[PDB]
Design a protein around this nucleic acid. Sequence first.
DNA 1: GGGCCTCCTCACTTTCTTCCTCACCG
DNA 2: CCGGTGAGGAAGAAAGTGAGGAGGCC
Length: 291
Amino acid sequence: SINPWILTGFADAEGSFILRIRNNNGMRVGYLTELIFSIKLHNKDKSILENIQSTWKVGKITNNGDQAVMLRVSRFEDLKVIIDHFEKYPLITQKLGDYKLFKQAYSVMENKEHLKENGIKELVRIKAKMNWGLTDELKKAFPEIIERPLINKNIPNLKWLAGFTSGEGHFGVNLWKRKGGTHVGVQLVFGISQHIRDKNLMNSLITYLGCGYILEKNRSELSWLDFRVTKFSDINDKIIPVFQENTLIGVKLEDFEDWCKVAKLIEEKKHLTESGLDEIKKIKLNMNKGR
DNA sequence: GGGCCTCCTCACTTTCTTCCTCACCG
DNA sequence: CCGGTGAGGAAGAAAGTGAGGAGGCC
Ligand SMILES: [Ca+2]
Ligand SMILES: [Ca+2]
Ligand SMILES: [Ca+2]
Ligand SMILES: [Ca+2]
């Protein structure tokens, strides 16, 4: 079983709370409602999904294309397990806002209002604030209101951070040919990325870890944040000890382990030698996108 | 025994991850 | 010169979010 705070951190990273409201003339109200918690990952991390499944004793795992796998809970009885966990171990990103709307939608269905016109209206109102909001077909049918409270929580513990890092983390080794010379540049880099909507939370990492900085990235109108640590003494003294104690999950754990081997070589200045570089070069082949 | 629920196959957009380059300073 | 560091941006796919179909529960 996964540590429950590791689980929440991972959920804040890769989870999704979904409210479906579908047209159907076979329903008395004319709409069929479905409430879904979902985690979609690459097949290489199917084991995480299976362990969450056994930990919660709920949910179904299905394939999605040739390289992806998906764990979903939508059975109404089984959804109490989801709410139970996330009440006891609350999300801290803006996704918590989706969970609370998810939660309200559940209360509507629990008293069975989704089977009435008054409830469907309420559900549409809820869905409008969730994720990507109302469809065009749904906006047409329901011209009424277009926002939710901003979530402002701090990092609860390093077990959450471990779960969140197992999702959004990057353990990288940069190599490049120096402009003036024949030497190869070497940089160990740690990274956590997130949409700019959680700028406060991402800023909170500089304080919480006692190192690193934030870089603002964008493509046209799309923008995100990358928390990076490139100070090696910080990585060696602050970053690595954290995840040695608080174990990462999935393939990213393996990436971290190789990453630490590179960190050892760099600690002993062997990245400056010819043979140490090709050892590092060999490790890169084993890790990340190369795994 | 009609709605109603649940689980399947399946697909859209983008938020992540990964990778690359390089000027600067001490 | 040289190595360490931080800042930039490119590429694209592993994510996030959500689609229709339908068997069968109660
Ligand atoms: Ca995420
Ligand atoms: Ca991930
Ligand atoms: Ca992610
Ligand atoms: Ca690439």
